[PDB]
Write an enzyme that holds these catalytic residues in place. Structure first.
Site, short mmCIF file in Angstrom:
data_model
loop_
_atom_site.label_atom_id
_atom_site.label_comp_id
_atom_site.label_asym_id
_atom_site.label_seq_id
_atom_site.Cartn_x
_atom_site.Cartn_y
_atom_site.Cartn_z
N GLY A 43 0.81 -1.20 0.00
CA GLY A 43 0.00 0.00 0.00
C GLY A 43 0.85 1.26 0.00
O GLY A 43 2.01 1.22 0.39
N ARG A 44 0.28 2.37 -0.45
CA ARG A 44 1.01 3.62 -0.46
C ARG A 44 0.41 4.57 0.57
O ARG A 44 -0.74 4.99 0.45
CB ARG A 44 0.97 4.25 -1.85
N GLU A 49 5.74 4.41 1.49
CA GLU A 49 5.48 3.37 0.51
C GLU A 49 5.72 2.05 1.25
O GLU A 49 6.78 1.87 1.85
CB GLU A 49 6.41 3.48 -0.69
N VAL A 50 4.76 1.14 1.19
CA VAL A 50 4.90 -0.13 1.90
C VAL A 50 5.10 -1.32 0.96
O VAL A 50 4.39 -1.48 -0.02
CB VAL A 50 3.70 -0.39 2.83
N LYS A 65 8.45 -0.32 5.29
CA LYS A 65 7.76 0.95 5.09
C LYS A 65 8.83 1.98 4.73
O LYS A 65 9.58 2.41 5.60
CB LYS A 65 6.98 1.33 6.38
N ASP A 153 -4.06 8.53 15.74
CA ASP A 153 -4.46 8.23 14.37
C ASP A 153 -5.18 6.90 14.33
O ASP A 153 -4.96 6.08 13.44
CB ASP A 153 -3.32 8.37 13.34
#
Ligand SMILES: Cc1ccccc1-c1ccc(CN)cc1Cl
Ligand SMILES: Cc1ccccc1-c1ccc(CN)cc1Cl
Length: 324
Positions: A43-44, A49-50, A65, A153
């Site tokens: 995923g981004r 960026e992962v 990551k 978060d």
């Protein structure tokens, strides 16, 4: 504004050495980037960026990551918090920290979690499953709050679940912060739908209770099958969406209690709203996930007054969890 402090774990950082919480003085030590071979993009993130990777020294899958280093201090804070919480219940494990030699880019290496799709989870989770996972998130929050850290978060995208193994991990500690009583924090944290009323009214002296608001937003979305529950279109409108459920009288009471000055941008959008009954969100598609205990629990998390919300430890003692 009137000062405030956490009702729990108030002085955990005050009574700890500077080394624990002074992330700016933390010495970061790189591992060997050559230990890891990138496999595929996962995923981004907004700041990252992962990638799925393989640790070639032990043949173990990991997650890398890659961080676009816009701010150095922020990276140090995330690293220090991850190191402090490493091994905590349901906290993602930071396995290594590496650097790309040529581009001088930093990367965090984590334990790999086979994440079940959010849409898939929404469709198949049972009433017992929602209680079980909510309790797993609470173990993580009560631990990080006990360690003097606010996540800031909390949202579904930051909760990885391996449903097959009933494994949950709270991730993305990039916005997390050490709680110091009386400290004024930046309100530009959390993701819009999960921002507590304190952030929306610019009340800077907030605490761990911010995470409990976010958790309530998640619970409300899943039991009612309404994602997100408070669908704001911007930060000012986010406060109106909350006001449409909790009513406007308690909003002014909250503002008055802490002597908060409302931004003028609210004047023409806020209006007047009655306090709604949680039972009004019950429908044929969600009634199998709603119960009197679930509504009582939700009512105790989703409160304007951050001091009135259940702490993670109180939440764990609620009847909603007597089955876990
Ligand atoms: C691409 C990158 C970015 C940031 C930090 C490390 C790395 C990196 C560089 C080389 C290697 C060796 N195959 C692995 C990584 Cl993760
Ligand atoms: C929002 C929520 C509430 C209760 C139980 C589970 C969930 C949930 C659903 C999807 C996702 C996505 N990784 C995460 C969680 Cl915690």
């Amino acid at each position: 504004p009137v000062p405030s402090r956490a009702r729990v774990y108030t002085d955990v950082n005050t009574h700890r050495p500077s080394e624990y919480w002074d992330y700016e003085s933390h010495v970061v030590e790189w591992g060997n980037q050559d230990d890891y071979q990138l496999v595929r993009k996962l995923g981004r993130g907004k700041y990252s960026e992962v990638f799925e990777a393989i640790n070639i020294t032990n043949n173990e899958k990991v997650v890398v990551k890659i961080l676009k280093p816009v701010k150095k201090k922020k990276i140090k804070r995330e690293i220090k918090i991850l190191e402090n919480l490493r091994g905590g219940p349901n906290i993602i494990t930071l396995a290594d920290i590496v650097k790309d030699p040529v581009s001088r880019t930093p990367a965090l290496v984590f334990e790999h979690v086979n994440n079940t799709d959010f849409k898939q989870l929404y469709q198949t989770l049972t009433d017992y499953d929602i209680r079980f996972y909510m309790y797993e998130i609470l173990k993580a929050l009560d631990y990080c709050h006990s360690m003097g850290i606010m996540h800031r978060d909390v949202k579904p995208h930051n909760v990885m679940i391996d449903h097959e193994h009933r494994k949950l991990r709270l991730i993305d500690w990039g916005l997390a912060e050490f709680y110091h009583p009386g400290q004024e924090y930046n309100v530009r944290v959390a993701s819009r739908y999960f921002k507590g009323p304190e952030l929306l009214v610019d009340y800077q002296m907030y605490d761990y209770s911010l995470d409990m608001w976010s958790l309530g937003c998640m619970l409300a979305s899943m039991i009612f099958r309404k994602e997100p529950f408070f669908h704001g279109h911007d930060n000012y409108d986010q406060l109106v969406r909350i006001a449409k459920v909790l009513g406007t009288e308690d909003l002014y009471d909250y503002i008055d209690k802490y002597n908060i000055e409302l931004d003028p941008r609210f004047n023409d959008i806020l209006g007047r709203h009655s306090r709604k009954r949680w039972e009004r969100f019950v429908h044929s598609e969600n009634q199998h996930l709603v119960s009197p205990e679930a509504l009582d629990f939700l009512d105790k998390l989703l409160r304007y007054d951050h001091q009135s919300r259940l702490t993670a430890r109180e939440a764990m003692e609620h009847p909603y969890f007597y089955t876990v």
